[PDB]
Amino acid sequence: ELDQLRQEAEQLKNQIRDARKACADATLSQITNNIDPVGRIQMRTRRTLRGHLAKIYAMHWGTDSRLLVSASQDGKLIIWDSYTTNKVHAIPLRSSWVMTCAYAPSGNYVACGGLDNICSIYNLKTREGNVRVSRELAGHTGYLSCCRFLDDNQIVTSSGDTTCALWDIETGQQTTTFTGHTGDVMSLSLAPDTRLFVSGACDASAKLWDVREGMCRQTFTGHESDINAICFFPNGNAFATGSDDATCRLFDLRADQELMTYSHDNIICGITSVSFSKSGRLLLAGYDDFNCNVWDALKADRAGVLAGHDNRVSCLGVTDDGMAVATGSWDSFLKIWN
Amino acid sequence: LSAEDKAAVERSKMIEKQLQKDKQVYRATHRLLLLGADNSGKSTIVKQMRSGIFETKFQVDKVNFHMFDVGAQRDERRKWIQCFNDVTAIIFVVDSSNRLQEALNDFKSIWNNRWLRTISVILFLNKQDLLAEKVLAGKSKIEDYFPEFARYTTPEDATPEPGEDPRVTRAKYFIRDEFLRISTASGDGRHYCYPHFTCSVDTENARRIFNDCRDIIQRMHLRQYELL
């Protein structure tokens, strides 16, 4: 019966809420009310990368923390050498409407996707010397919002058809379709161990998925609007999700609830992209107010402002070694901060 | 700088030259968003002047255009329309012949979208001949779906085609007036709506888009000079 199923669902949700409140022994602010503040950190624009014709919508660091891929909504995927501002590669794209790009951990492949409902995997290392389409993964009935490489063969893409998908580049077929979100998934962050990944959707909900055994392990609510960005804490037991409600939140997988809420009364814009520092003490969130904000992840105190972008900040990402942050905005500029 | 470093800088400079050549084309091409409903006539228009997103490159008067039609998507449009905050115009196609209120609401949240405040809308009222040959018959009454039709007179600034009954002109201009009443309200002058009448078989549609894109660009350039 539909009514009894709805009643059972409501009872289960009430039980989940009660269990979550039971574990709320204290707050992260109370536990970390004695640690010294990180201070007023100040990172300046050490390098501005120009050459993108249109608004940059995605950017991903390489494993070596020297190469940087950036996708612009002009049909261009540019791989830069972040140390020397040099452009290592300029890949034309079949579709000029691109919202995501992923750099493989090995550095031999680069992904992109957008309103073409297709994940294009390009082979950087080829005997022919050029970058060519290695694969065109299709099967998503909607725009691809984010993509992340597990390895040289497996990529997981969250697309605006309320689904994520673990693919298989060799066969070009979906290996596991993660369903359960009621709205378009905007971003997904891979756990460092690659066993799990969390994806936030336009339903004010993030969801943890087991990549091997495809299912939603945990669901996290608390946001009042669409989650635009999700990032995984370096430890891998927590993740920060920013929404277009001028709020980021830190959720612990073990506590299964929000730990801290980063927000300010002077902030009315929406978070577009979120990244964590290597230590996890700093949470860098790009907003719609043309500047990013550095938050104390353990105290909910704003620690800095990465002002300098003339348009909305679309993406920001920390290096694997934590050396420098990169920020791509709609002003067609990539800025590196230290 | 070593030899390989210098050669890498040379590769970067060649990439920059190619990017400049590509910019010479990107800045000279005007992007448009083809929006509408399933029973609107978008497919007929894209078939004229000649899954994912579909790109149609139509050039008239020696200026290239790029019309993008969004397909294989869902009702949640707000999260991909942000990608179109820099296009020249949104060609919004409406079937003038039941679901007219649904299409009128669809015109809102596109006119009133916070990412399209400076985005002009070229409004196409497609398949006007269906309305023409449907309104002579009394089977369907426009006043039945829209009550404020009897208490409405045809505008003085109307240019009916030679051979059009007054009822046809009154109905089509009532639909247009509904759309422009939605458009002008909550409009700060940053973007303008340009209504047109089409029958889905008209070689002039590309010319209308041309003449309207030139007007949009003209007003934006004038605004850059603080002349308007």
């Epitope: 040099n86 005997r127 | 040379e10």
Partner: single-chain antibody
Framework: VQLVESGGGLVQPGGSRKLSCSAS????????MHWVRQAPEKGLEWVAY????????YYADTVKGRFTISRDDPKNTLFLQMTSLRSEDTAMYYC??????????????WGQGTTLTVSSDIVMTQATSSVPVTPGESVSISCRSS???????????LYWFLQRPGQSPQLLIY???NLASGVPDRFSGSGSGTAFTLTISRLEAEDVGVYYC?????????FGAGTKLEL
């Protein structure tokens, strides 16, 4: 991905001849191309370099002015025009492709060569001119430099090439520790400024031949004498 080189033969001294190299299988435009010759029963000598886009053109000090290099990207063919020929210019002229970016593998592919029979610099020293080789054992070829090859970038521009009997040289190691594509994992490279060792573990057949060490820190590119491994 193959480069086939033609336009060579018997030339009277003082003559002029155009050496053509036609490429097929890779992007000619994005690849810089070098001409590197090898005199009979001698080592490897760099002759010329035409960069991607014909921007920087470099010539060896011994062929400067007499030789000119050019490329045709639409025709995918690289030309070496040779004027005022000398008897000290007889060699098998090899054409190599080298692309330059971060993580690139310059000098990755060589061609087949053309016989042209005619009727300061960073000196590379290879002390071992010949080394006995037994299959299954390990060997360590040594190379020395006249100046440190470790730039401020942290890259030690040393290249180890292998030339099998009757075959064109094949890239083995680039930047003094980097295994080239298709090269077995047994090969390794190590060393520091003005000292380099290439170690081959579990030496096998089809591995004998002449090993060459080359510098890429600054032009002109100078190779080594060549260490011969034979069974």
């Amino acid at each position: 991905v193959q480069l086939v080189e033609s336009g060579g033969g018997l030339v009277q001294p003082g003559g002029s001849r155009k050496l053509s190299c036609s490429a097929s299988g890779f992007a000619f435009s994005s690849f810089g191309m070098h001409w590197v010759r090898q005199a009979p029963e001698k080592g490897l000598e760099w002759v010329a370099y035409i960069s991607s886009g014909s921007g920087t053109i470099y010539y060896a000090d011994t062929v400067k002015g007499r030789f000119t290099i050019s490329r045709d990207d639409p025709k995918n063919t690289l030309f070496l025009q040779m004027t005022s020929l000398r008897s000290e210019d007889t060699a098998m002229y090899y054409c190599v492709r080298s692309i330059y970016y971060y993580g690139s593998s310059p000098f990755d592919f060589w061609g087949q060569g053309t016989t042209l029979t005619v009727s300061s610099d960073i000196v590379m020293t290879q002390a071992t001119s010949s080394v006995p080789v037994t299959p299954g054992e390990s060997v360590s070829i040594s190379c020395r430099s006249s100046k440190s090859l470790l730039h401020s970038n942290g890259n030690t521009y040393l290249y180890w090439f292998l030339q099998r009997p009757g075959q064109s040289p094949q890239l083995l190691i680039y930047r003094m520790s980097n295994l080239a594509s298709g090269v077995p994992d047994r090969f390794s490279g190590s060393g520091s400024g003005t000292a380099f060792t290439l170690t081959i573990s579990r030496l096998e057949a089809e591995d004998v031949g002449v090993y060459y060490c080359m510098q890429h820190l600054e032009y002109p590119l100078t190779f080594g004498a060549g260490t011969k491994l034979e069974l």
